Design a binder for this molecule. Sequence first.
Ligand code: A1EBM
Ligand code: A1EBM
Ligand code: A1EBM
Ligand code: A1EBM
Lengths: 617, 617
Amino acid sequence: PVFSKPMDSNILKKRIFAAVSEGCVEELVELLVELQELCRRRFLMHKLTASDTGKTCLMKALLNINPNTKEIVRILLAFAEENDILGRFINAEYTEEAYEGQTALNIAIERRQGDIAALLIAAGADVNAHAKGAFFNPKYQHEGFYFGETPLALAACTNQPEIVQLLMEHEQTDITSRDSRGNNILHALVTVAEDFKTQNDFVKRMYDMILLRSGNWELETTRNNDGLTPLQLAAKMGKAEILKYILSREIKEKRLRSLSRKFTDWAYGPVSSSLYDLTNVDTTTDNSVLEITVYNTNIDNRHEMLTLEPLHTLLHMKWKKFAKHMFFLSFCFYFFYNITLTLVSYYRPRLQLLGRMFVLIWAMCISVKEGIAIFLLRPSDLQSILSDAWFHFVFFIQAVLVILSVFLYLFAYKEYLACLVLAMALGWANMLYYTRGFQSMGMYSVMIQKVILHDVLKFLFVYIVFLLGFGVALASLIEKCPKDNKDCSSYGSFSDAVLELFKLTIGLGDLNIQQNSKYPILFLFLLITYVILTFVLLLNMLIALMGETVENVSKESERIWRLQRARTILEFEKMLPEWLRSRFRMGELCKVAEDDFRLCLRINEVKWTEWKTHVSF
Amino acid sequence: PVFSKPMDSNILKKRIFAAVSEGCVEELVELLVELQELCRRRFLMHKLTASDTGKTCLMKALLNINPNTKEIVRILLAFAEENDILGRFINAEYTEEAYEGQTALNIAIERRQGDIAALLIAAGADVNAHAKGAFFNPKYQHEGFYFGETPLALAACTNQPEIVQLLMEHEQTDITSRDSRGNNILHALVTVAEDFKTQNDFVKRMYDMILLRSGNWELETTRNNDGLTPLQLAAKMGKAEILKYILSREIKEKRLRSLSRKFTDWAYGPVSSSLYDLTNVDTTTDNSVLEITVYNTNIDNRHEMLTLEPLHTLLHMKWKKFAKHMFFLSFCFYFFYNITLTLVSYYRPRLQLLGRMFVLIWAMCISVKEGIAIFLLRPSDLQSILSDAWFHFVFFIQAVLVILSVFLYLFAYKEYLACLVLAMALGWANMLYYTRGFQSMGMYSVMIQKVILHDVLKFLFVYIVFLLGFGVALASLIEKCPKDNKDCSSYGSFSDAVLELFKLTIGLGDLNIQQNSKYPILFLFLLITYVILTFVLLLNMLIALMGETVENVSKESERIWRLQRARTILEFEKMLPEWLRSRFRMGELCKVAEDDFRLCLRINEVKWTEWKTHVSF
Ligand SMILES: CC(C)C/C=C(\C=O)C(C)C
Ligand SMILES: CC(C)C/C=C(\C=O)C(C)C
Ligand SMILES: CC(C)C/C=C(\C=O)C(C)C
Ligand SMILES: CC(C)C/C=C(\C=O)C(C)C
């Protein structure tokens, strides 16, 4: 965080700023009387405002607060009344690029002072004046303080509800005012919340106050500049507490029940048949909160908010309804394609040609989907943890290897086997993708990907360094055995010596010690020290590396597997044509409203743990 | 949980239901006067009751409670007094299949209201009216709310004891009333309890109140529809707190001491000689709580309630008395059978025939017990965790292989060795069953079964996929070496290539790189990538998989072993003939009662930790 200029720096007009900084009033009141007539003996009181910055004495007084500050603000404003410049004095604007648009009301609200803040507003302060500075609108979280760039949202982003209540009651205040980010009062509150459960979080408590007092459906429907309602913004930023509050918001009182996203129908002991609203949760529209929350648009907090009631059962009625019947079909139609690819080519000649045609019409079928899936892929997802993109190359590669091989079959480049037989080894290793449909083995394949990434690549990369150095060092010592024979040359070339070192790691071959080295002692010293760096230092410790991996993750392995399946639930859903997606939850109900455009959903909740505890008191 | 119709849906007779729903009375009292004479100008007031459902205004008023509801129920009943239809109005019944039999008293009791509930009962409410609906009687735990289908048990299943106390004092209330499940007031309380220790659990507190006020032995002896006393039902559902309370129930006061299952004889400091009752705990009868609690009829909570005092020492005096003397005999008589099977057949000819006869008369002896044990087995136990059934096939298979082999011995099909020599390898691996009699190694064999199931099968299943794909891929590249010789063909067929890959995993053989591949580079690329998927990715990680297994279980391995032994304690007991089971605990004592049919048991309890803490205050 680097800012070119500071807001307040306590390092003949300087007497104005010095007097208000230390809070001294006696040196100011008599001296302010003197200033009254400098302009007369000379309409535009420049002298009491700074030049390089727009900061005035009013901003200077409030930025350097003290118990004497209240005694200064009242007389400072009275000076502008005599010169009739209170309009320009109160609405004075900062001019630095970092802090631009900050007014005296903005600083008074920040410094936890409802006394002067009410006084300035009553004096004609510019309510809903936007602080459109680079500092107030940081490019990241740590580059500044973003709060919505309005005095109302600043009091809302801070924990001062009294100044909020005063600002709501003001007539000139524009509630549905959008700042330079296209945000709102509710968008700003969503950004400043946190996903970590805090005992005393005012954001969801103040979300209720601002929304209810507005009492209409325009704050929750106003779109962002990127294009995002306050509902969807909480999903993009991963705000679970706000998402749980918004999706399950029930208003008991009349005249405001239209602001409810969940209308409980009936309750009887543990079971209650709540009737939720999903007018912006189902994937019928674009950028749904369900679609946003399952992809890697949220960070480090997905399952704790993918289990929320309106959308936890949205996936179950998508899996148990059409996704399960298409995972088997994808499993069967790929198992048969792999079996046919193996069968018709293991029996290759050194009428079953209709089976070979099936591989032709299906390798193109896989690659046309993978080819179009690569285009929708982005580098922001290609290298990540929950990418689900590595399976998009290897499905494409195994498909593109088959069609490339057969193009060289009839054309007879003799390389038709160099590409086809690599598809068998990859095609059968691709069969492990379709094990997500089982909990016991789907969690197992989750462990494999974490093991193959955190530990195996780190072991191999060190290993080739010990294989390149020791391969060259061992092969360099060996002269050419006489008689021009291939004997004496187990370590004769770099490729021959590296291969013999690799066979030493697994445990295959004979460890000869008289391999025609011109230093027999040095060759053995370099041999009985290679196996203590790999077999004793690395291979045993490789087993040790993965123990930290399978102990920290095993309590989250069942959590990551569900997110894999929940992604394929809607990845399958987008493949259905528009006429096929005519099967949805339920019709329009829950309210007369605007002629009932409320796509509701009835899910009964039988909760035994809470009800048992509730009656226990 | 899916219900076709809702109980209460707040989405010219509709004015009746609307007025009571919102609690408005002014719009009802004058309008109810109007209704009085619609039927006259027209015995059967249909108009104020619903048609598709039996719900009336009384049910509608109580389902939509409000502070004005008490002001509505009193005048609503007075309307039926004038028409003299209070009998049909109060006893009005629901008619939906989901919710059937629900009355106005049932809803009033549910909504924590003892005021109206007492008023309805005083008005002639149908006490002990059964709500025999599909919702009130769910097929599972999450399909509804089961509470015993009576107003008394509903107040008991909820935490309202005042309405219970009122219902006990009523004359018309039938305490020993059985619902559609054959349950009782005490059966229903057992079902709604929980095995997790809760600080404030009313169920065992309300079990005391209902049983004592009844003051007789008919609630604890009334059989279920499945056939189960309230004692045995707590064992089937795994209710440890109720089981600990019931089995150790001591009533101090006279006239009710006959309702005690434990009569403490004397106490002196730490040692107290409690004298328990096991009239339904010992295995003398069928479906004993001891027999039920040791088999896999309880779930996830067995050792925390198999250690309860009446039945923790019931097994110790069965092990130290006849079970230990039959485990050695089973160990010796099977060790000798295995030794004889090995000895008389390792020396097979390429008079000791009496030893061969012993295997004949004992292989049939094993298979006749295993054959009859398979019939008593069920698929509900065949595939489980604490099955103790896998040892029933392999004991049967090893027994059936011996008799099958000798049938081909004299008959001379020459296959007599193909079945007999497989019995040695299985017969000696069966010798590890009889290691349950030792703590150090019995816990070891518990680890093996968990390791062999959670980890080894998951590793092998992935391994054959990498062996099928790489076996075909390696064998496909190899042409037939000239001269029609068997050289050049280490990977010549599928079986030859798969075998050479398996030997690569363990570490046997020579890793040749010039194995007559028509692509020497591609064969090596497919070879130095198979060993990084098994030897580097799988075999090392296999060791890693079992580390989560031996760290989470080792604190429970000593717990599962006891349940294995406790099952064989009564598995041995059922083998004794009726005359042999003439040795039991102790006679009839502890009370005069009904001519003393109380099979008691005296077990002295020397408790030093509690007594030391008790005197410390
Ligand atoms: C390209 C062939 C060598 C198969 C490659 C793999 C599968 O075995 C990788 C993905 C592990
Ligand atoms: C043997 C390979 C194919 C396993 C590696 C993966 C597949 O599961 C990726 C996803 C890490
Ligand atoms: C049938 C023979 C091969 C013995 C089989 C086993 C014992 O070694 C299995 C039970 C592990
Ligand atoms: C070598 C085998 C016989 C071990 C496996 C078992 C026996 O202990 C079953 C019970 C898992």
